[PDB]
Design a protein around this ligand. Structure first.
Ligand SMILES: CSCC[C@H](NC(C)=O)C(=O)O
Ligand SMILES: CSCC[C@H](NC(C)=O)C(=O)O
Ligand SMILES: CSCC[C@H](NC(C)=O)C(=O)O
Ligand SMILES: CSCC[C@H](NC(C)=O)C(=O)O
Ligand SMILES: [Mg+2]
Ligand SMILES: [Mg+2]
Ligand SMILES: [Mg+2]
Ligand SMILES: [Mg+2]
Lengths: 368, 368, 368, 368
């Protein structure tokens, strides 16, 4: 491969239903898409960044900037390009994992299509379909919340995940467990909302039989999680914290994590994500696929990933309709609480031009 | 893919020069080669077992049997096959890593060729050539040993590794450091010949500035290695003990190893081997490619693997001629202490039929 | 002694009722038998290997090959032979414990009968009988199980073992505890069937008061068990993982075991079995005899071992008729939950020829 | 068997040359012998206790007593008697290991002699000869010492042990290293003479390259030895502290010992001794036979013992003439630093009555 250039697209997609988290509400999804361009064909990449630096320090406009001025250029400059080589090529730039992962993807997509290979084959899928769960937002009311869960539960979702915030913890759970029963697959997500000093509160959930608690404390607070793990019964699961395989190895080493949520862009690439999977696996730590409310592009790479062997817990790989009415690709449709792993070269999906143009807000071409 | 069958060959290659280890003297190499047949095309796999069970429990005749009666059959009996599904497919059978790795190899090649991909591309190479060291056996005399060293040193080999054994330790090493200097890459390999009680004697090599000592103790003695490490200055490197990515992680966690020698057949396959690479890498453990006196087939696969990012040490990927006068494939030729990584699909190499047939002793077809 | 040769015999013995494990079901029992020939007399040995590598990497055909080609001949070669010297004579060959164990036994039996001493004598017995429990397969139904359990309880079986498997854990347990009570000697066996990631479900068994969980995880996952052991209540027991006294020690050392199932063949001989016993003892770890569905031959020397001092828990030494209608020896009959330790020299029992020949499929001589 | 009775003798052998320890000068050796009297044949036993309670609380007369009144009787009362059973039989009695040791020994001998078995055979010997070193007492002068040593060195002794005491440490060492060279197997023996507070002085030996320091501190000070092992280069050897297999296990687990000195009587028998060996082995702890200035009666058994596998270091099994001018059995002669392992049943040696009666100072029957 030889990099000809990339096309940076901004994309706005209205959410079907506002999505509330510890960091706020989301009614509309701005994304960043990349179209890799090589002499042979095209490759698409999606960036998980958001408008503002709320989940992380990375935001859309900042991603754009680095990609433009630093990353992309860097790659164009290179004689021979390999997805694998991207890393080494961009190594000199500290951070910007999400952005670097977006780029990698685009390239990899192209690389794979060129060899007629799906993301799944590369990654090492062992399945064809994958159990899906769903992430439910914070509510304003308990019934509003219960109705919703009942909603998703009916659709066939296999697991229920609750966004928590101090103020929306125990109760919400107390509620779902009560209503829906104890056999449901429930788990919660703080997105960093708590402090070690909130332990008791969190210990308040021990009773509820959760599978895990996701990132109760800040991203840098590994030890703290380790400590927290000590004071509570609900299993710790890290997200934000896991920005790499080595991070995972360290957190596991320290006892700060028992289950790992994998988010490909957070870790800087689907490639790195495979390693993380592999590392955890070696340590006996279970992984599951996380989600960034992506279009059908990332959704598709994620489904492929999620079919790896250590993903022994359902992922946030919901169907397309959970967030979008109209997906830029062929939508993802839940079939028996499952999604099928794409079969075509590369992602195994592509944007429906028409669709894409409808939701595009900007564009740009980065060529040498 | 769908497996059509596998041909089993028995090869018998003469050794340029007898090869002495802590387990015994070797003049002729007996191999087991596999040709996996698929709708798509053939694939080649090489098994590292040997005549007897001296390095491990695995031996040629045994691998053959297991292959023939359990493993091949089980794959044949699957609907879809992928190199990656081979593992789960053969998981019901305990052990036989070497045999498994051969088969996966054959599969993988055949699969890679189809997608017109190279082992190296698949594995994640970031290098186009690799530093090669040389494994120097046990000599009858020191002079003899010194000449040989001198010889290899001239061919341009980058590092020297000396087979050791009780009665062939500190001298042979003192002498080589003597002659050749302090600036040479020197390391040693006991092939499990020592005991913890021997620490004192091994402590004797402290002064020579070796890079590592390879498998001082028995295969199952990890804790011993962690202890042993506390007794010597020479860093520990494990070979026989690393039978998996999990083995690796365990040993690392226990402080039993500081550098890992990856051997694909020993760990059940190239795929597993990548995982080890990745695990180590995440724990800051350097790896380096092992060698089992393979033909160009296995040599090729190894060069590819050895071009991965964490192989920060010269491996035992010497030139073909180091062992064999006539290799059944294009020969591997040292260019400035390096060997070039193959570019073609799959192994990037294949057997020269007329050559292969010469060395072939037995063949069999394993189909449905 | 002086080894004159060995008679390999193949034996098929239909099961009294199909025996289902996490690794599959078993209606018949192929076995390997060895008749050790000395200028003085005969010796018998039994190999625990099965048809295929489902419990371990060892299998009947595999053991025969190694015995034939490597092991037996290595002993015949030796000038003077002691059961004790067997080890060091066969040391060059890696692994192959089950086989190595049978041979030893074969040898031992001869050597003893020659000193007019019983296995029990040599091993260091302290009892005259031993309490027997029984291994209870995986059933088709719960009732089916229950009958069976009850059935055994009445025969007089001292303790109950329940083979478990994901999908056959808690319930089958919940049942026996419920129906049969709380004062029954209950323990399970997951023949490696779980994963650390399954802890929670295994945690689900805390309440039943089981004596122990036998081998929840893979053979190689010792640190896993130690971790596991920190997540459940049910004490851990290892079988597969314990291949030697050294293995024992390490496990213990690591906090991955509290009770040890002793399987002489597994560990490579009755002699090593003794050693394990003593090692476990020294660490305050209780042991108990494991069974490998043996003939009266194996069953006899096991009853002998089961009589050592640290065997402080009922072993799997069920009466002959629990599996076999007709034994090649004089049956082992349960007299009030116990079995009598043999009194003759060597094993104490011999094959009832007429009975052998009736169930012997192959035969071979291995002389000079 | 059936114990018919025990004849207790007192013996008094005049040392060749006074032997000085950190506990006192020795001119004559006063032992306790035992004649097990069975229906079949008789057995010999030899107690390592000394005249007074100096090495340990046990002493000749205390021994007699307990034997006579407690021990002997216990066994006679028993219907069935096997050396193995002696231990359970004498359990109720707290301590007196040397005494139980001597007794067991007597029984064992008889038992073995009745199966026509050797001590060796039973214990599991693998060698036929053992490597002997010597125990060099505290001299009055340096030159004196040096002479002796060279004295012993010339006879063919393989390793040198130097008794030490505050004031007899470094110097004496400095002297033998100086004069005799560095490639001498040198080791010391403080017989409990130091304290943790003397670490610095003992650290003073670091330089000499000793194989070990035997029992630097008190019997009960395990943890102190572990601490000590932290403050010194010289590897810690325990003697007095090793009263059992368990104790070995524990001391090792705590890092208080790296080499273990085996004294059969000190541990309560030969059986136990074997176990300690086994234990140590399983933990990669080398062992070596310890001597208590014994006749050709203890000497024999030991020699057998010393032929076990884990006896990786030269024992204190000096030739008969190192202490005694005229042994009560066939003397033991150094053959190239070695001492042949006795081939006859039981100890393989007996006391020459003429010789015996000469040294005996008393006698006594103990029957029913
Ligand atoms: C843009 S919010 C990201 C946080 C995310 N929630 C979901 C359901 O996508 C998670 O932690 O899995
Ligand atoms: C059965 S040989 C195994 C030892 C091998 N060296 C070479 C190149 O032979 C290695 O230890 O890397
Ligand atoms: C043939 S599988 C053997 C496993 C054995 N059970 C019995 C009852 O023999 C055990 O407890 O592991
Ligand atoms: C009176 S000897 C006691 C201590 C003893 N020395 C010898 C030579 O027997 C030893 O440490 O083995
Ligand atoms: Mg999250
Ligand atoms: Mg090696
Ligand atoms: Mg079991
Ligand atoms: Mg001493």
């Amino acid at each position: 491969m030889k990099l000809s250039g990339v096309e940076l697209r901004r994309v706005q997609m209205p959410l079907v239903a506002p999505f509330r988290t510890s960091f706020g509400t989301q009614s509309v999804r701005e994304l960043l898409l990349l179209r890799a361009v090589t002499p042979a064909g095209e490759g698409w990449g999606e960036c998980v960044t958001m408008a503002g630096p709320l989940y992380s320090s990375e935001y859309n406009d900042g991603a754009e900037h680095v990609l433009r001025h630093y990353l992309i250029p860097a790659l164009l400059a290179a004689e021979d390009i390999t997805a694998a080589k991207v890393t080494p090529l961009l190594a000199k730039f500290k951070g910007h994992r999400m952005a670097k992962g977006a780029l990698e993807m685009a390239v990899l997509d192209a690389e794979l299509r060129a060899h007629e290979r799906s993301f799944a084959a590369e990654l090492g899928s062992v399945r064809d379909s994958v159990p899906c769960g769903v992430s439910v937002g914070i509510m304003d009311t308990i019934p509003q919340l219960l109705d919703v869960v009942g909603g998703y539960l009916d659709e066939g979702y296999v697991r229920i995940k609750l966004k928590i915030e101090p103020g929306w913890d125990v109760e919400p759970v107390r509620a779902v467990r009560e209503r829906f029963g104890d056999d449901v697959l429930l788990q919660v997500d703080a997105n960093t909302a708590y402090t070690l000093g909130d332990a008791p509160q969190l210990a308040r959930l021990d009773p509820f039989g959760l599978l895990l608690i996701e990132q109760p404390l800040e991203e840098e607070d590994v030890l703290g999680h380790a400590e927290l793990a000590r004071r509570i019964q609900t299993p710790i699961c890290l997200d934000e914290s896991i920005v790499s395989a080595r991070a995972a190895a360290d957190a596991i080493k320290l006892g700060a994590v028992q289950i790992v949520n994998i988010k490909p862009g957070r870790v800087g690439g689907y490639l790195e994500a495979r390693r993380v999977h592999d590392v955890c696996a070696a340590h006996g730590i279970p992984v599951w696929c996380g989600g960034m409310i992506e279009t059908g592009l990332g959704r598709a790479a994620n489904v492929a990933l999620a079919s790896l062997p250590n993903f022994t817990l359902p992922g946030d790989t919901s169907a397309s309709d959970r967030f979008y009415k109209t997906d830029i690709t062929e939508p993802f449709v839940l079939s028996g609480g499952h999604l099928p792993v794409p079969t075509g070269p590369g992602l195994g999906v592509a944007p429906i031009p028409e669709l894409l143009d409808e939701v595009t807000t900007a564009k740009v071409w980065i060529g040498s």
